[PDB]
């Protein structure tokens, strides 16, 4: 229906088309990535400093931490959008690691279209302190992209990359891609 073939354009990187979007996975440090949006998997108070969130908030800087607590004390947010600070992005989207991962990724995609952005980089959302299972997280991330494509919503978004802290979790994402392959 939408899925292309799984291949490797670089050592340790795996990709496939999902409609007009190139979907990629790799292991490494997400704070070294460049993309229009980088996603942070945080807590419901937007101030977690454990797992990948520690590295993202430290590298982003204190002006970003204050955007987070200022917005947190304004309304009940499901996610928040901040500046990039010292990360190589235009915005950070902070999602709640314990929330439904398909819902969180759908919201990220919609917000990126609203800004006419082309590239997104995210971690394996919820696999840190939220302790969601890696298989369920992989299934949810890829389902969200499939649904966005199916609805004809992808216009500006062309590349979605998951940069994963543990190589063992990358293996789970690769297997999920091969299950879907066209
Ligand atoms: C030494 O461990 C540092 C670390 O980041 N661990 C770690 C381990 C497993 C998953 C995740 N992921 C997220 C989203 O936080 C992080
Ligand atoms: Cl998490
Ligand atoms: Cl991760």
UniProtKB/Swiss-Prot annotation:
A glycoprotein 3 binds at residues 29-30, 41, 52, 126-130, 165. It comes from the Eukaryota. Residues 10-181 form the Macro domain. Induction: Up-regulated by IFNG in macrophages. Down-regulated by IL4 in macrophages. Auto-ADP-ribosylated. Transmembrane segments: none annotated. Belongs to the ARTD/PARP family. ADP-ribosyltransferase that mediates mono-ADP-ribosylation of glutamate residues on target proteins. In contrast to PARP1 and PARP2, it is not able to mediate poly-ADP-ribosylation. Has been shown to catalyze the mono-ADP-ribosylation of STAT1 at 'Glu-657' and 'Glu-705', thus decreasing STAT1 phosphorylation which negatively regulates pro-inflammatory cytokine production in macrophages in response to IFNG stimulation. Interacts with STAT6. Interacts with PARP10. Interacts with PARP9 in IFNG-stimulated macrophages; the interaction prevents PARP14-mediated STAT1 and STAT6 ADP-riboslylation. This is Protein mono-ADP-ribosyltransferase PARP14.
């Amino acid at each position: 229906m939408f899925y292309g073939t799984v291949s490797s354009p670089d050592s340790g990187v795996y990709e496939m088309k999902i409609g007009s979007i190139i979907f990629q996975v790799a292991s490494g440090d997400i704070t070294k990535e460049e993309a229009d949006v980088i996603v942070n998997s945080t807590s419901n108070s937007f101030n977690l400093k454990a797992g990948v969130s520690k590295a993202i908030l430290e590298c982003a800087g204190q002006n970003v931490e204050r955007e987070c607590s200022q917005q947190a004390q304004q309304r009940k947010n499901d996610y928040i959008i901040t500046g990039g600070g010292f990360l190589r992005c235009k915005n950070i989207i902070h999602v709640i690691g314990g929330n439904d991962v398909k819902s969180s990724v759908s919201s990220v995609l919609q917000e990126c279209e609203k800004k006419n952005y082309s590239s997104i980089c995210l971690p394996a959302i919820g696999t840190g302190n939220a302790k969601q299972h890696p298989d369920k997280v992989a299934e949810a991330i890829i389902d969200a992209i499939e649904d966005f494509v199916q609805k004809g919503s992808a216009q500006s978004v062309k590349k979605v990359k998951v940069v994963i802290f543990l190589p063992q979790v990358l293996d789970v994402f690769y297997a999920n891609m091969k299950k879907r392959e066209g």
